[PDB]
Design a protein around this ligand. Structure first.
Ligand code: SF4
Ligand code: SF4
Ligand code: SF4
Ligand code: SF4
Ligand code: SF4
Ligand code: NI
Ligand code: NI
Lengths: 169, 762, 397
């Protein structure tokens, strides 16, 4: 289940690179967040991914930004989720004065799950270069532009890692 | 007669309008890299918004890169237009009048930008000149140490976009007037599209590119010798539309066929279908010779832009070239003489068809079984796939006689070969996918409407009434390239959804080809289900890429017809009018090229919002507005000059979307305009709420921000929404009259005239 | 039941995919709206006589007469037809229900899924009545009666024939002196800001979609909206259709672009057109005549200009003297360009327009108007008007 193994890329965004963290470090970083925002994508509609995302969000009462067409999954659920565009969210996160979804203020750390690499990397470029909002990627693809991320994982390995993170939250 | 303030504009003249746009729609930079490779002082690490050795920060670098893409697209359009215009004037004479259609303004973009009113063909000659001169100036800005601020690169990119639109309009006007293209015909002939439309029992010529000059000579030679009934000619990319519009103003069915978009470019070559390949200018794969020589498929260059490192046989005899290509060392030649090319290509195809028989890259069933058994699931192909397809899972499934995963992956794949070059086993994954989807390819047949040209000044008037009486919810312009994230069916789904709700859908480029490819359960396509008129519930295909200048021009005509505004040198006025009143949104789902960037930027400078595919985030620039900041949503009333509030729509000038449901919701929401009356606002709110509920499970949270009047609400759920307004928002409402008496922050007043310019206020 | 939405307007229920066909060519179909005082009208009530939705067989045709009884404080029969003019659209708001034509040519079908889901006619009529009450809020009470017997539908159709004849006669006999208010429309100000429209019983609106009754009903719906009532007040010129109230309202709502607007005039402050006129009218000064061109004419006028060019000079909400935009029913107005001589000034017309508006051209002036078949150039027009004794000959000295 070791996630920090396959730190392999096809192209590089430069010298600065994401940190490949284990399940324990990811759980600690999620539990220590001052104001986390669970940024989720349309790729979470897989039943295992959806169940694990709901459990992760409800474990720490994390509000969800359901970017893309991922809102229909959370309508029947209980987690507080709101819809927003990923590009618009990336633009807003670089603004310290943004009230946010609840109006309580801008966020600190964003958790990413269920995204396409060429899209989330492009948004994270702006987010990580023009702001101080940290990003934790619990997806099965190694995201370079995130502050912390999992390594390249199999789907079964990703499911196991998500389950372990749930049991360690 | 009357001229505006900005004829023949430059970077300084359009600075005010671009800056006004950027104050509301802030630029968002998503850099594609942390380094600069430009000059020997580098490469410079600009990560963390640091500065290079020239003092340029990363925002400036991203702005410069996007500006370079825009000027490259503008240069492509302008150079194609210049070559076409020179050839047309050489053959047909410089005194040929412009015959574009039944219209009052025949060159809306030329009049809007330059301020001139061309009449003949030679009148287009100075305009092109102006563009090229400006290009040089803009190109000078790509040099190191040529600008410090990113806003000054964004303004120059906007200028590049509008110049690009001028170039496309010049090119399309010249080609339509000269080569007898359809002139605003709502009943343009239908032409077959797909790989399953080329009969392999005849010699096959395949034309790839964007020009039509040599293609016209090829068709003329085919027609003169009566070879049209025994030789099949197909077009890839916009040259297919250009060849299927050739002399098709009489609506006779065309013998030319359309193969597909750029994605099919390699796949057809892999199938052995083509017998001769001709390449003109652009959107041409740079390894066609590499994959064609293996199959003995001659490749012929026809333009000085693309010589493909081939020998130049221009001054020679056709028989010697034919003999050398047939049995010799050269896989092709550069044939810059158009008559010689038009004579050589048919004879070469005829003499090569019986000699390349039974040659294709498709593996045998046993060969494909061995190939699928060779894999070890190392994951390199999935890592190198631009669309991130799950190739190893498909190969593992197919190891046990399950060839349907590759069949599914065929539509999503773009035929880019990048997976093959990282496979240590040398497995031709592209050919494996083609073999698995052979039957589906054989089933691929569709119909598309030929390029009508521009929209006539009668259909615009016929549709203005429908747009003001709340029966046409808006205009959706589906354009762009074919680098789709999830296959070519997304554009079809979006177009079908918006046509079912009686929008005005206008299509062009590769998107039209990939929309006209999915027959319905009744065996019909969208172009046969809905007519090609400019009216609600109708879909019209303007034509090739250079036809997009008409779509934007349509918006300008709306300003010049119903408002009577001057077009000559009135970029700011007409752009403000379009931004505040005309409901039109562009959609580029698969844009990859710099031409698409130029077209989108030019549309943005005209005030038309655009939604692009998820890949377009690699363009490094978007334009998004801050909804929460209420001080960035104020205009001036053109009668009082006082400050007036507007609804936050459109909320962006260019943006990206991940899935097609999100694109549908964004397109529906962004058709709203501040000046909409009760009926138009009501119908737009109805469709936006319905789409949001259908594709997101929830209804929007900002709907109340667009309700100025009790007539603004949808008809079906008026009481259900008024109760929510009273309860959730606390608005004051009268129940006997079903009237909102208080609560809106903007009182409805149809006579109000929003403006972003203080120089046009009483 | 079903879902009401304007998306299902192009839904065509084919014969292979429909439960029952109501009305149409083979049978006799009818729809009607009748106004009654608000004491015999029951809201939320549908009366069905004979067979119902569950008592019908597939692939058949039924008469299917529909009668609507409306009641309200400010409801008068003059708007009945106006209500009918919406019925079609409302029927096309119910999913799986197809409506075609109006008056006595109605053709309503029902889909298999919709018929299997409803199982009766009560919810459909209730939804139609709820839409009509939501759209026009002045309708306090509304009731519907559905007839499916052949004999009852024939009786209702005879009554509807007499009612339609009476309504058409009343509409024709209405004039500008039988009324005290005109109706102003500014809905086009979304695209033509300084453009006001005034409609009177003797002058149909610009686009042909609005009449005096339509504007009156719209003003009743919302007096202070973009469709308002104008008090003509003191008449200033009967020949040129000048009214003080209309003049002041035009000055107020025009942002000071045109001070005066003279109805039924061609050169003295004419009506202002945005871009949406069904018909355009040009003035030939060599022949001192007026020609007209409709939107669908792909040919060219004797001056050498088509509809697009000759319509690109009369628009924008301005008041340029010369070309004037009008509708299609304006030819039937008794005071048709009266201050210009009227039909005595029309010199040229396309063949399609003449064959369409034959009912408006007087019997004496029918053989006095040129067509594109007869005249190709201006000299040919002069020769044609010299041969056929057009009254415009006298003005030439
Ligand atoms: S943008 Fe491309 S060429 Fe320039 S430094 Fe980055 S990777 Fe290299
Ligand atoms: S242009 Fe500037 S940032 Fe780029 S390499 Fe040269 S000095 Fe460095
Ligand atoms: S690169 Fe080749 S060997 Fe590796 S997983 Fe892909 S197909 Fe298999
Ligand atoms: S050829 Fe197709 S499957 Fe292979 S990398 Fe390119 S897009 Fe992916
Ligand atoms: S043209 Fe017709 S719809 Fe437009 S403002 Fe005039 S009367 Fe109203
Ligand atoms: Ni109008
Ligand atoms: Ni108009």
């Amino acid at each position: 289940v070791d996630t920090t193994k396959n730190t392999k890329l096809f192209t590089s965004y430069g010298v600065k690179t994401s940190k490949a963290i284990t399940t324990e470090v990811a759980a600690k970083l999620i539990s220590k967040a001052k104001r986390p925002l669970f940024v989720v994508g349309t790729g979470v509609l897989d039943p295992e991914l959806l169940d694990r995302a709901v459990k992760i969000a409800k474990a720490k009462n994390i509000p969800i930004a359901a970017t893309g067409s991922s809102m229909p999954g959370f309508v029947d659920k209980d987690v507080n989720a709101k819809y927003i565009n990923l590009h618009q969210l990336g633009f807003y996160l670089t603004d310290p004065d943004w009230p946010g979804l609840d109006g309580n203020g801008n966020y600190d750390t964003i958790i990413l799950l269920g995204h396409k690499k060429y899209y989330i990397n492009q948004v994270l470029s702006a987010v990580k270069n023009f702001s101080d909002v940290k990003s934790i990627s619990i997806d099965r693809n190694y995201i370079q532009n995130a502050t912390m991320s999992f390594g390249n994982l199999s789907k079964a390995d990703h499911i196991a890692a998500l389950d372990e993170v749930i049991d360690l939250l | 007669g009357p001229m505006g303030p900005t004829p023949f504009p430059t970077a300084a003249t359009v600075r005010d309008w671009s800056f006004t746009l950027f104050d509301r729609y802030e630029p968002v930079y998503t850099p594609m890299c942390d380094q600069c490779c430009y000059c020997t002082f580098g490469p410079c690490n600009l990560e963390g918004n640091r500065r290079g050795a020239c003092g340029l920060d990363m925002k400036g670098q991203a702005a410069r890169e996007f500006f370079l893409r825009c000027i490259t697209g503008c240069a492509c359009h302008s150079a194609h237009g210049r070559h076409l215009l020179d050839h047309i004037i050489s053959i047909f004479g410089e005194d040929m009048p412009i015959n574009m259609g039944a219209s009052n303004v025949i060159a809306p973009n030329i009049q809007l930008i330059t301020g001139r009113q061309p009449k003949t063909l030679g009148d287009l000659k100075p305009i092109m000149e102006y563009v090229e001169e400006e290009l040089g100036q803009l190109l000078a800005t790509v040099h190191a140490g040529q600008e410090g601020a990113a806003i000054d690169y964004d303004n120059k990119a906007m200028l590049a976009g509008i110049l690009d639109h001028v170039g496309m309009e010049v090119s399309d006007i010249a080609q339509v007037t000269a080569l007898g293209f359809p002139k605003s015909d709502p009943e343009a002939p239908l032409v077959e599209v797909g790989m399953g439309t080329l009969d392999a029992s005849k010699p096959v010529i395949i034309a790839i590119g964007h020009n039509v000059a040599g293609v016209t000579y090829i068709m003329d030679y085919m027609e003169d010798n009566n070879l049209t009934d025994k030789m099949e000619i197909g077009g890839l990319c916009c040259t297919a539309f250009d060849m299927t519009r050739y002399k098709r103003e009489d609506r006779k069915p065309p013998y030319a066929k359309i193969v597909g978009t750029i994605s099919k470019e390699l796949k057809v070559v892999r199938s052995g279908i083509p017998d001769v390949i001709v390449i003109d200018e652009q959107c041409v794969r740079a390894d066609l010779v590499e994959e064609g020589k293996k199959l003995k498929i001659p490749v012929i260059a026809s333009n000085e832009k693309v010589m493909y490192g081939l020998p130049d046989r221009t001054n020679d005899d056709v028989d010697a070239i034919i003999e050398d290509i047939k049995t010799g060392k050269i896989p092709g030649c550069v044939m810059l003489d158009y008559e010689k090319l038009g004579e050589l290509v048919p004879r070469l195809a005829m003499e090569m068809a019986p000699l390349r028989e039974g040659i294709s890259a498709i593996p045998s069933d046993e060969e494909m079984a061995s190939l699928v058994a060779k894999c070890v699931a190392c994951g390199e192909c999935a890592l190198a796939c631009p669309e991130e397809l799950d190739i190893p899972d498909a190969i593992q499934a197919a190891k046990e006689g399950d060839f349907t995963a590759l069949d599914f992956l065929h539509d999503l794949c773009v035929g880019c070969r990048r997976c093959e070059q990282v496979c240590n086993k040398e497995i031709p994954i592209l050919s494996v996918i083609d073999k698995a989807a052979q039957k589906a390819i054989a089933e691929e047949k569709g119909l598309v409407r030929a390029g009508r040209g521009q929209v006539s000044d009668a259909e615009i008037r016929a549709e203005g009434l429908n747009l003001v009486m709340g029966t046409t919810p808006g205009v959706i312009a589906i354009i762009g390239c074919a680098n789709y994230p999830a296959g070519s069916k997304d554009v079809y789904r979006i177009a079908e959804e918006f046509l079912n709700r009686n929008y005005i859908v206008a299509v062009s480029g590769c998107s039209a080809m990939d929309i006209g490819m999915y027959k319905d359960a009744d065996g019909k396509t969208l172009y046969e289900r809905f007519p090609g008129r400019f009216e609600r519930g109708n879909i019209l295909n303007t034509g090739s890429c250079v036809s997009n200048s008409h779509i934007s021009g349509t918006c300008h005509k709306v300003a010049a017809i119903f408002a009577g505004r001057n077009l000559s040198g009135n970029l700011a006025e007409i752009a403000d009018y379009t931004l505040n009143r005309v409901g039109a949104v562009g959609l580029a789902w698969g844009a990859y090229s710099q031409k698409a960037a130029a077209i989108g930027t030019g549309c943005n400078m005209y005030g038309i919002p655009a939604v692009l595919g998820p890949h377009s985030g690699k363009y490094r620039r978007a334009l998004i507005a801050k909804t929460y900041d209420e001080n960035k949503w104020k205009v001036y009333d053109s009668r009082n000059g006082s400050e007036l509030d507007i609804p936050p729509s459109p909320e962006f000038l260019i943006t990206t979307a991940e899935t097609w449901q999100e694109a549908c919701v964004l397109l529906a929401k962004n058709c709203i305009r501040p000046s909409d009356n009760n009926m138009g606002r009501s119908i737009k709110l109805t469709h936006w709420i319905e789409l949001s509920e259908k594709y997101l499970g929830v209804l929007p949270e900002d709907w109340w921000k667009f309700v100025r009047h009790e007539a603004d609400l949808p008809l079906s759920r008026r009481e259900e929404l008024l109760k929510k307004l009273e309860t959730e928002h606390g608005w004051e409402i009268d129940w006997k009259k079903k009237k909102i008496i208080s609560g809106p922050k903007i009182k409805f007043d149809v006579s109000s005239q929003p403006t972003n310019l203080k120089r046009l206020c009483k | 039941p079903f879902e009401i939405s304007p998306m299902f307007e192009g839904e065509r229920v084919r014969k292979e995919g429909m439960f029952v066909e109501l009305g149409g060519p083979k049978s006799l179909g009818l729809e009607l709206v009748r106004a009654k005082p608000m004491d015999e009208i029951e809201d939320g009530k549908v009366t069905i006589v004979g067979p119902d939705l569950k008592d019908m067989e597939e692939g058949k045709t039924y008469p299917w007469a529909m009668i609507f009884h409306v009641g309200g404080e400010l409801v008068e029969p003059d708007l009945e037809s106006v209500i009918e003019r919406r019925v079609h659209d409302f029927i096309n708001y119910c999913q799986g229900i197809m409506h075609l034509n109006q008056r006595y040519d109605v053709w309503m079908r029902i889909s298999k899924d919709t018929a299997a889901k409803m199982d009766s006619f009560e919810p459909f009529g209730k939804a139609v009545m709820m839409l009509f009450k939501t759209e026009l809020p002045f309708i306090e009470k509304m009731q519907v009666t559905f007839y499916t017997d052949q004999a009852e539908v024939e009786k209702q159709m005879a009554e509807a024939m007499e009612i339609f004849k009476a309504r058409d006669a009343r509409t024709k006999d209405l004039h500008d002196e039988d009324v005290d208010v005109f109706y102003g429309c500014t809905l086009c100000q979304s695209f033509a800001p300084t453009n006001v429209c005034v409609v009177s019983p003797d002058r149909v609106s610009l686009c042909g979609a609005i009449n005096w009754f339509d504007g009156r009903a719209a003003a009743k719906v919302d007096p202070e909206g973009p469709q308002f009532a104008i008090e003509k007040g003191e008449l200033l010129d009967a020949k040129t259709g000048e009214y003080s109230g209309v003049n002041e309202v035009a000055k107020k709502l025009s942002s000071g672009e045109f001070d005066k607007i003279k109805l039924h005039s061609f050169f003295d402050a004419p009506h202002t057109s945005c871009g949406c006129f069904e018909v355009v009218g040009f003035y030939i000064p060599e022949v001192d005549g007026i020609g007209w061109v409709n939107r669908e004419y792909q040919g060219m006028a004797p001056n050498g200009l088509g509809f697009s060019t000759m319509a690109g000079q009369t628009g924008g909400g301005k008041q340029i003297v010369g070309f004037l935009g009008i509708g299609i029913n304006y030819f039937y107005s008794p005071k048709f360009i009266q201050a210009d001589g009227g039909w005595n000034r029309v010199v040229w017309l396309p063949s399609m327009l003449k064959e369409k508006i034959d009912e408006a051209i007087p019997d004496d002036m029918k053989d006095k108007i040129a067509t594109e078949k007869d005249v190709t150039d201006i000299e040919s027009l002069k020769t044609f008007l010299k041969e056929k004794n057009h009254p415009v000959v006298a003005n030439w000295a």
